[PDB]
């Protein structure tokens, strides 16, 4: 997606080397993770309050079983709304 | 195939000096060839007809919307290509009909460059009232905001 190639620093045309990789789950599984969130697109900004209790729950509802790194850039979908994580 | 048929047919009509249907069959070409993908053959036709149209006393007013269509066709250009033809175009400022030629473009283009997609809707907001919008231009409203969102997200 757009942010991923903007976090990986890619360019369609560049030749990457993709290789399977596996985690050490009993040392690497996530149990508590903080994220800095903000409106992905600044053209659709609102002042509405948004329930984090429902956003983290929708976060795990969608981003279960996925690989996440420190400093990684991604998008969050709350009611089809793009946020920038 | 049918667009090629209009092309060849218009070629024969140039060979008869009924530029009438040379222009008509080419407008049928470019009106769909534009939204399909092709904005250069489009403006080729729409400049050809507008330039051959300032000639006649019968044709020069149809040339207004023709150079409009010749101006509209963007290859997702954030520049003034529409306003480029305007800086060529014979607006004749006392003639208000070319506000349906550029004043639309005059207002919305600055919006498009300067981070104002939100402002972009307010042009058609009134122009659909002072000119009921058809399929081609409305689909083009969506298409040139595909060029917006291909500058923003797409």
């Amino acid at each position: 997606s757009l942010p991923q190639r903007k976090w990986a620093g890619l360019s369609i045309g560049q030749e990457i080397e993709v290789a399977l990789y596996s985690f050490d789950k009993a040392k690497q599984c996530i149990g508590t993770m903080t994220i800095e969130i903000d409106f992905l697109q600044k053209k659709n900004i609102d002042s509405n309050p948004y329930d984090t209790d429902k956003m983290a729950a929708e976060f795990i509802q969608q981003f279960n079983n996925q690989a996440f790194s420190v400093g990684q850039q991604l998008v969050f979908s709350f009611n089809d709304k793009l946020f920038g994580l | 195939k049918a667009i090629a048929h209009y092309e060849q047919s218009a070629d024969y009509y140039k060979g008869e000096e009924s530029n009438s249907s040379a222009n008509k069959c080419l407008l049928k070409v470019a009106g769909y060839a534009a939204q399909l993908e092709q904005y250069q053959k489009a403006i080729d036709i729409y400049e050809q007809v507008g330039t051959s149209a300032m000639d006649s006393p019968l044709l020069k007013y149809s040339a207004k919307d023709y150079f409009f269509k010749a101006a509209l066709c963007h290859f997702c250009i954030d520049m003034l290509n529409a306003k480029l033809a305007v800086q060529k175009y014979e607006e004749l400022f006392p003639a208000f009909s070319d506000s349906r030629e550029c004043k639309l473009m005059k207002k919305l283009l600055e919006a498009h460059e300067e981070q104002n997609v939100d402002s972009y809707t307010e042009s058609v907001k009134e122009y659909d009232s002072i000119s009921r919008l058809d399929q081609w231009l409305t689909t083009m409203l969506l298409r040139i905001k595909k060029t917006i969102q291909g500058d923003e997200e797409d």
């Binding site: - | 007013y61 149809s62 009909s97 000119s131 009921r132």
Partner: protein
């Protein structure tokens, strides 16, 4: 003297028609903005055809 009077007073609003009746003229000026353009719309396309 030793007099300080600092005072205030209230306003008389001139009868500016004092009814909504202004609207009807405003409705005529709506319609002259509204019903005029399509003449030109169909005019230019009548001229195209």
């Amino acid at each position: 003297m030793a007099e300080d009077a600092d005072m205030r007073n209230e306003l008389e609003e001139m009868q500016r028609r004092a009814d909504q009746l202004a609207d009807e003229s405003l409705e005529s000026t709506r319609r002259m903005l509204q019903l005029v353009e399509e003449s030109k719309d169909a005019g230019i396309r009548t001229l195209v055809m």
